[PDB]
Amino acid sequence: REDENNPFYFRSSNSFQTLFENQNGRIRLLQRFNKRSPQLENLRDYRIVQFQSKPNTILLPHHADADFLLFVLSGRAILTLVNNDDRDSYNLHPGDAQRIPAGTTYYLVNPHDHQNLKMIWLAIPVNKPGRYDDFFLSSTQAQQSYLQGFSHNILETSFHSEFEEINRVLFGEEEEQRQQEGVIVELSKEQIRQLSRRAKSSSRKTISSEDEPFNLRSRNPIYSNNFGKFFEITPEKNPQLRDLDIFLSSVDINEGALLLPHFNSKAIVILVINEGDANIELVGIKLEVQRYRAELSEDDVFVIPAAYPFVVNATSNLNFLAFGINAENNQRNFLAGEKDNVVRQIERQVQELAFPGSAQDVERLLKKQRESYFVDA
């Protein structure tokens, strides 16, 4: 079972509906994990969102029908969350994760003058499982302000103004030239040079922060050697992550290397390729062993059900982000290698029954791979 016929593989060229596109940027939405394959029913409440904007741009003020968990892959972002009585600005860098609670009004700036901003947001809708909506305050040539949803009368009395003034100042649909083109607009260094001022960054101490942004590489990867690096922040360590019962991981795999076969005890992992190419082999039980395989590339998404063993083989320098749903107390069990090899953790005698070989034949074999987590392919 491979490509297309593989329910866990989500080739990017045919798995994304774009919510909005412009010459200034683009927001894409991965299709529903369960509409795709009913086998991923417990991921019905989640959605993957890809975001990218050009230098000097800003995603206009809006709020969504869902709770988001942002992650910066590359570039710098300036996230400002506007509440009803004040405001909070965060300067995000690659590796940064920040939580935007459901229904929170915000805008996002890419302050880099010669570079793009690339992100991956995890959406968790509140009203209808798996589906949400963006409400934009602004009125652009691309979409109406949601305030246009109330009648002139209410707007007039609500704002204590004649509708002519309300329309002129906030909507301006009578002269599109005074309107912005879409939800993502370009800026001049001048403008940007202003918004950036006043903004909190992440730092060693925020890994434990209740509301500030935290970086995945603020600590030593849990696994690291000549072939790859595996960084991960768990619910136990971060309060935002604990609220969602999710873990985050960023892992690098060198060209020609593979992340040993292994499985997660309880976490359903959503993995998306950020860069590179790789071959992933997943194992299910039709007790006939079922082989699910695919060739992954940039922007592809692949999900690994809990307890399903898998392997990532890098055909070029690779890097992927990973969301561990139902992460609480998860245990990663490697099937090969020295460290965390659940296999070679069984009692000699039991190993003898489990396999044709024997006490020594088994262990002798399980001792041939001297490396751990990442090995050379």
Of 16 and 20, the one with the shorter C-beta distance to a copy of itself is: 20
Give the pair of three-digit tokens for residue 221. Answer: 């990867």
Backbone angles phi, psi at 96, to 5 degrees: -75, 140
Smallest distance from the beta carbon of 360 to a copy of itself, in angstroms? Answer: 10
Residue 56 in contact with residue 83, Cβ under 8 Å? no
Instruction: Give buried/exposed letters for 18-38 (b at 16+ CB in 10 A, else e).
Output: eebebebbbbbbbbbbbebbe
Kindly list the distances between the CA atom of residue 90 and the CA atoms of 20, 249, 256, in Å, as whole numbers in the listed order: 24, 21, 37
CA atoms within 13 A on the CB side of 106: 23
Candidates 112-120, 269-277, 316-324, 368-376; binding stretch for a copy of itself (CB under 8 A): 368-376
> If DSSP codes are grouped into helix, strand and coil, which group holds residue 14?
helix
Q: Judged by CB under 8 A, does residue 356 bind a copy of itself?
A: yes
* Interaction mask 14-33, a copy of itself, x per CB under 8 A: ------x-------------
How far apart CA 90 and CA 76 sit, in angstroms, is 10
Chain residues 201-230 in contact with a copy of itself, contact rule CB under 8 A:
none
Candidates 68-76, 147-155, 231-239, 314-322; binding stretch for a copy of itself (CB under 8 A): 147-155
* Among 5, 13, 17, 84, interactor with a copy of itself by CB under 8 A: 84
Q: Looking only at Cα atoms, what is the longest distance across the chain? A: 88
Chain residues 158-177 in contact with a copy of itself, contact rule CB under 8 A:
158-161, 165-166, 168-172, 175
Q: Judged by CB under 8 A, does residue 286 bind a copy of itself?
A: yes
Candidates 9-17, 25-33, 199-207, 343-351; binding stretch for a copy of itself (CB under 8 A): 343-351
Candidates 57-65, 217-225, 246-254, 269-277; binding stretch for a copy of itself (CB under 8 A): 57-65
CA atoms within 13 A on the CB side of 259: 26
Candidates 9-17, 113-121, 201-209, 359-367; binding stretch for a copy of itself (CB under 8 A): 359-367
Q: Judged by CB under 8 A, does residue 199 bind a copy of itself?
A: no
Q: Judged by CB under 8 A, does residue 359 bind a copy of itself?
A: no
* Among 9, 10, 308, 323, interactor with a copy of itself by CB under 8 A: 308
Smallest distance from the beta carbon of 116 to a copy of itself, in angstroms? Answer: 19
Instruction: Give buried/exposed letters for 224-238 (b at 16+ CB in 10 A, else e).
Output: beebbbbbbbbbeeb
> If DSSP codes are grouped into helix, strand and coil, which group holds residue 244?
helix
Chain residues 87-126 in contact with a copy of itself, contact rule CB under 8 A:
87, 101-105, 107, 126
Smallest distance from the beta carbon of 102 to a copy of itself, in angstroms? Answer: 4
Smallest distance from the beta carbon of 17 to a copy of itself, in angstroms? Answer: 12
* Among 233, 253, 271, 343, interactor with a copy of itself by CB under 8 A: 343
Q: Judged by CB under 8 A, does residue 54 bind a copy of itself?
A: no
Contacts of 47 (CB under 8 A, 6+ apart): 29, 30, 32, 66, 122, 123, 124, 125, 130, 131, 132
Smallest distance from the beta carbon of 216 to a copy of itself, in angstroms? Answer: 22
How far apart CA 105 and CA 263 sit, in angstroms, is 38
> If DSSP codes are grouped into helix, strand and coil, which group holds residue 68?
strand
* Among 133, 164, 236, 298, interactor with a copy of itself by CB under 8 A: 133
Neighbours of 290 (CB within 10 A): 11
